[PDB]
Design a protein around this nucleic acid. Structure first.
Ligand SMILES: [Mg+2]
Ligand SMILES: [Mg+2]
Ligand SMILES: [Mg+2]
Ligand SMILES: [Mg+2]
Ligand SMILES: [Mg+2]
Ligand SMILES: [Mg+2]
Ligand SMILES: [Mg+2]
Ligand SMILES: [Mg+2]
Ligand SMILES: [Mg+2]
Ligand SMILES: [Mg+2]
Ligand SMILES: [Mg+2]
Ligand SMILES: [Mg+2]
Ligand SMILES: [Mg+2]
Ligand SMILES: [Mg+2]
Ligand SMILES: [Mg+2]
Ligand SMILES: [Mg+2]
Ligand SMILES: [Mg+2]
Ligand SMILES: [Mg+2]
Ligand SMILES: [Mg+2]
Ligand SMILES: [Mg+2]
Ligand SMILES: [Mg+2]
Ligand SMILES: [Mg+2]
Ligand SMILES: [Mg+2]
Ligand SMILES: [Mg+2]
Ligand SMILES: [Mg+2]
Ligand SMILES: [Mg+2]
Ligand SMILES: [Zn+2]
Lengths: 126, 60, 204, 81, 102, 154, 96
RNA sequence: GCGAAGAACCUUACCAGGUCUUGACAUCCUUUGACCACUCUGGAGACAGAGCUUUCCCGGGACAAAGUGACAGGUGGUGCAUGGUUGUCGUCAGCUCGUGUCGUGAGAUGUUGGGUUAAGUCCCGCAACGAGCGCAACCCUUGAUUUUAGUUGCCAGCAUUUAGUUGGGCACUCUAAAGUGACUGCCGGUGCAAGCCGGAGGAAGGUGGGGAUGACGUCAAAUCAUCAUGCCCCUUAUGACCUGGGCUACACACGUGCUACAAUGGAUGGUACAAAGGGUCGCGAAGCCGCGAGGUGGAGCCAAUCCCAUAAAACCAUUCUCAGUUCGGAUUGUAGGCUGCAACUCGCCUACAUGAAGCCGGAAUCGCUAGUAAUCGUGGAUCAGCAUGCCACGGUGAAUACGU
């Protein structure tokens, strides 16, 4: 229950939320290991810190795809969409921090005549 | 010196390594795609004409 | 400034490509067979005002339809010229070939047919200015909302080449819901080589 | 052949010197095959190798075994600037 | 110290022609008292109606010198291409100095 | 000649452990080639040396290190007819912090010790005591700007 | 126990032809699952635009192929005959 | 790092030597109708001499045998004789026409003036009233969502498996067809109107992000060598075949790139996280062998099923301790692997040993405004073999913009 499938870059994160103690499960693996950076760890709890429910629910995460930071962003959007399903009363609170928005930034495409997205080969006058 | 060259490529060579690919319509050696067996020029000029199935100009 | 090919810009958007068949591992084998079929059709039917030819291939059977403005030479009283096609195509196709013939109504609306009629006059020692204008005023009665044509090359026997174009109507090239026809043809003269370009903004 | 399946020796070159052992460096051998590794049987013989426009004679030693014919027939004509 | 590069097309770059181009464009040193070493791109071409063309590019740091001429014979064009180049050096140098001195 | 003028500015996220804005903006300044782990880790461990060597507060001492090297004045040269005059001018609030971190890290690389870990931690100690290269350069900016006080507004 | 594979360059022919099978199959072999839209496979061909010079100016072409899937659970004696009779036009390749 | 999206022979257009003249490639002549292929000898091969066979099918035929002609053949010249194709100003916002009017006339007006815009985009005024090509939109792709559909995809809730495995179900993702959605739509202020500023709703707000799309014309811009083609030229050769060489040279000058000059680093051990593509004379697993490049082997796959294919930076431990070094790898000697008839000129990779310049680069100069620069890996075209080039994919991920 409480399905809040969220996305970031190339990552898709399906999150089912249940009341509990606060344990986070990612692909049948402890979340201390999957996310090594404590800096990447705080952003996971932003939807859980605007509303005081951090030590009340357990998240079961089955993410697939994207880089290690990619799942961190996609799991933040994952819980917020699922948490908003728990009670619509949280919408003004989460909207203030811009947590419902799905980030639209994606890596560009390479262009012919260019060495990347916008890099231009060195110009020589003469 | 091209009519001789095209005829030479048709017949079997001494060894399998002498063989190579040539454009069917015009006959230039460079830049031939073996999906269509056309060179890069005949491919463009004839894809515009709507005669290569599936092929269409690519925006993305 | 160079212009994109008006036909090529619209393949798969509003129109459909001529040769419509599907095969894998036989692509280059089938594709160059069509290039051979078109070469022979364009040879014998040079004076029949044939414009559109498509290939309809299905399970070792070749189906071809001919769009003709004047099918009387292609089929009709003689009833024996069309059958020579299937007898003159079995040697290179090696497949059971069936040919169909379709009338072209309002032949002045087809950019292909307008092109050579302009072209055929150029080697008839007709002035380039007159030849284009006569075709422009003929097509406007047919129901087209636009036409503009140019002839470029050693123009009127001049040593220095130049291009001349005449337009009236509406020919929006950048619009994608346009349905604009296109044709380019060669005018074989004794002073050089000339080419004519014609594009018509059709009705719908 | 730079593998175990080698070595590679040209037929018409190998056969010509093989029957020339009776000559024992009595006839110059005029050949074009530069892609043949020099065999022990070749030692003491003199062979004329085509260098692109002419034939250049080389006397085969024992130290030349295992090398190619063309190594001793320089092609590009360099004389400084 | 100027380094030259002549692209002779439809013509042969004979040594007398090379010396003529080198010595005539070499007098520009008097004007621009420090000419940093740079490459000169010179192009020569002759038509069927006996007309000669010269193109010169001398990319000095802030000074992009060009001049292109068409005349009867090869030597007239080279002698007449100094005037177009000398004007630009005199134009560019005296523009900088007098304007910052209001 | 072109351009509309003012533009938006990037946001900063509050880092854990040492929740601050300067710390997050300092991590991104000394990061190279987008390796957050390398640059972030040396800063977090550097604060340990701040506590062990002279333990006052890792959050503090770093503070007045910044407020001792951020410049108050600035020079924005302009070219007038005949000669170029270095015009003194104030420093905006945003560039106040930017010119501090850049001066801190440019001279932390030039300190000349074994590891960047020690070099950055030691440099802020000198700044917190009104010493070092980072403090030295700010005085050069002030001395030059106050020497040309004449045509400040004129 | 019969599967059908359909591929085509243009889906308009594909989707219309696919529907023809579904209606005919359910007449005898009522156990017919809906068409499955298998992923499309795409290929690009970048080509130099000019003839002689100008490698920096190019042009790109594509070839997108669409695929479908038809599954039948319990066949009928006429189901194979019904599938055999329904001959799709060109531009679509069938495979039992 | 331009034609060249692959120069060992071929390619090859050049050179040396060895050869042919209705010819290597098509038409019309005339006799047979299959014609060859192969083996042996001289062969560097092309080609010279012999034998086995050449079975055509249905008076037709295409090729081949035989000699003749009409003829063929030129990557020979002219891109200032041309067609077609492309670059550039420049995705800059301009360039013209019809009717009217002013001026003896070339010309003018419309297209100017006041606002606004990314935009001759729009409003008001006006001796002008309208139109066309351009701008904008229509096209593709990314970002949110509903119905259809559950296989080769997914595993909520389940029982089982070494492992979503197997049974089971489309719940969720997912794939792809059809739709909704963004249109200054609404509100407040400002203005007379265009419009401008802010705010709410929303995933997205002010042409959302990115592509395809390049007006009249300028440079007698490039291409007769992709193809076509006027004129000129050659034709026992400026045409045709073969081997070998060369296009890979080297006192030097310039442009474009790759690797470094180390401690945010080198070395050793463990381990996590992708997207986009290719595969039938093809991909090639497990297993066994070798330090290694690689060898044997043959599973499965005409593929959401199998393979290519273990992603690398990053993370965690030990060690090295500021040196031309445990940095850097050029260069070279030996021993091997792989493709190919063949690796010397002239291929790629592996093992051992040798260990160079180089410690941030003068004058000068280049790129980039957000998933951008920076950095790290991956795939594809050409391809028997060979890319530090080209075209695409994703991971991590900044600083600054006062202003003209
Ligand atoms: Mg350039
Ligand atoms: Mg090859
Ligand atoms: Mg003089
Ligand atoms: Mg380049
Ligand atoms: Mg050769
Ligand atoms: Mg025989
Ligand atoms: Mg014989
Ligand atoms: Mg030109
Ligand atoms: Mg614009
Ligand atoms: Mg005017
Ligand atoms: Mg105005
Ligand atoms: Mg606007
Ligand atoms: Mg307009
Ligand atoms: Mg309003
Ligand atoms: Mg808003
Ligand atoms: Mg547009
Ligand atoms: Mg020219
Ligand atoms: Mg030229
Ligand atoms: Mg020609
Ligand atoms: Mg070369
Ligand atoms: Mg090392
Ligand atoms: Mg070698
Ligand atoms: Mg070693
Ligand atoms: Mg030294
Ligand atoms: Mg050092
Ligand atoms: Mg390769
Ligand atoms: Zn071609």
């Amino acid at each position: 229950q409480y399905y809040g499938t969220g996305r970031r870059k190339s990552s898709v994160a399906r999150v089912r939320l249940v009341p509990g103690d606060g344990k986070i499960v990612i692909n049948n693996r402890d979340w201390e290991d999957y996310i090594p950076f404590a800096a990447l760890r705080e952003v996971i709890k932003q939807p859980l810190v605007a509303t005081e429910t951090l030590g009340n629910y357990d998240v079961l995460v089955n993410v697939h795809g994207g880089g290690y930071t990619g799942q961190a962003g996609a799991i933040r959007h994952g819980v917020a969409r699922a948490l908003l399903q728990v009670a619509p009363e949280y919408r003004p609170a989460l909207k203030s921090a811009g947590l419902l928005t799905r980030d639209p930034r994606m890596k560009e495409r390479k262009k012919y005549g260019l060495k990347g997205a916008r890099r231009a080969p060195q110009f020589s006058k003469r | 010196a091209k009519k001789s060259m095209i005829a030479k490529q048709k017949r079997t060579p001494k060894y399998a390594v002498q063989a190579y690919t040539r454009c069917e319509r015009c006959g230039r050696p460079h830049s031939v795609i073996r999906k269509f067996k056309l060179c890069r020029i005949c491919f463009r000029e004839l894809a515009y004409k709507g005669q290569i199935p599936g092929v269409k100009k690519a925006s993305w | 400034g160079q212009k994109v090919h008006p036909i090529g810009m619209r393949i798969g958007v509003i129109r459909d490509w001529d040769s419509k068949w599907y095969a894998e591992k036989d692509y280059a084998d089938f594709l160059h067979e069509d290039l051979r079929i078109r070469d022979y059709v364009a040879k014998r039917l040079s004076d029949a005002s044939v414009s559109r030819v498509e290939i309809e291939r299905a399970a070792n059977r070749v189906n071809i339809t001919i769009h003709t403005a004047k099918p009387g030479m292609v089929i009709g009283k003689g009833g024996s010229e069309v059958e020579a096609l299937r007898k003159n195509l079995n040697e290179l196709t090696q497949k059971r070939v069936h040919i169909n013939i379709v009338e072209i109504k309002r032949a002045d609306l087809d950019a292909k047919l307008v092109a050579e009629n302009i072209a055929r006059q150029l080697e008839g020692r007709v002035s380039f200015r007159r030849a284009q204008k006569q075709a422009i005023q003929r097509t406007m009665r047919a129901g087209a909302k636009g036409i503009k044509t140019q002839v470029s090359g050693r123009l009127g026997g001049a040593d220095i080449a130049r291009a001349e174009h005449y337009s009236e109507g509406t020919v929006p090239l950048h619009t994608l819901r346009a349905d604009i026809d296109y044709a380019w043809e060669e005018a074989d003269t004794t002073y050089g080589k000339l080419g004519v370009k014609v594009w018509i903004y059709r009705g719908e | 052949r730079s593998l175990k399946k080698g070595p590679f020796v040209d037929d018409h070159l190998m056969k010509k010197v093989e029957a020339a052992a009776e000559s024992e460096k009595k006839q110059v051998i005029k050949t074009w095959s530069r892609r043949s590794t020099i065999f022990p049987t070749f030692v003491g013989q003199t062979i004329a190798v085509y260098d692109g426009r002419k034939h250049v004679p080389v006397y085969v030693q024992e130290d030349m075994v295992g090398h190619k014919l063309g190594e001793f027939a320089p092609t590009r004509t360099y004389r400084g600037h | 110290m100027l380094k030259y590069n002549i692209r002779g097309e439809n013509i042969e770059v004979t040594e007398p022609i090379r010396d003529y181009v080198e010595k005539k464009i070499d007098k520009l040193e008097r004007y621009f008292t420090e000419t940093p070493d740079a490459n000169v791109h010179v192009n020569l071409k002759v038509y069927s109606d006996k007309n000669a063309k010269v193109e010169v590019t001398i990319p000095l740091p802030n000074l992009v010198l060009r001049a292109e001429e068409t005349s009867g014979d090869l030597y007239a064009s080279i002698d007449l291409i100094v005037d177009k180049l000398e004007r630009q050096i005199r134009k560019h140098k005296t523009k900088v100095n007098r304007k910052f001195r209001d | 000649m072109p351009r509309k003028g003012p533009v938006a500015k990037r946001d900063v996220l509050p880092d854990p452990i040492y929740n601050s804005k300067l710390v997050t903006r300092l991590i991104n300044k000394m990061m190279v080639d987008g390796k957050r782990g390398k640059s972030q880790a040396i800063l977090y461990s550097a604060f340990d040396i701040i506590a062990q060597e002279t333990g006052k507060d890792p959050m503090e001492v770093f503070e007045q290190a910044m407020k001792n090297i951020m410049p108050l004045l600035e020079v924005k040269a302009r070219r007038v007819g005949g000669a170029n005059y270095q015009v003194p001018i104030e420093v905006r609030a945003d560039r106040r912090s930017t010119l501090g971190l850049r001066w801190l890290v440019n001279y932390a690389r030039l300190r000349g010790e074994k590891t960047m870990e020690v070099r950055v931690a030691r440099e802020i100690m000198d700044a917190a005591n009104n010493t070092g290269a980072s403090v030295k350069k700010r005085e050069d900016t002030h001395k030059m700007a106050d020497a040309n006080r004449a045509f400040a507004h004129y | 126990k019969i599967r059908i594979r359909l591929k085509a360059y243009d889906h308009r022919i594909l989707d219309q032809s696919a529907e023809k099978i579904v209606e005919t199959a359910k007449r005898s072999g009522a156990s017919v699952s809906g068409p499955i839209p298998l992923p499309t496979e795409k290929s690009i061909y970048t080509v130099l635009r000019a003839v002689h010079k100008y490698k920096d100016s190019r042009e790109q072409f594509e070839m997108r192929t669409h695929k479908r899937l038809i599954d039948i659970v319990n066949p009928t004696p006429q189901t194979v005959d019904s599938l055999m009779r329904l001959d799709l036009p060109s531009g679509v390749d069938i495979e039992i």
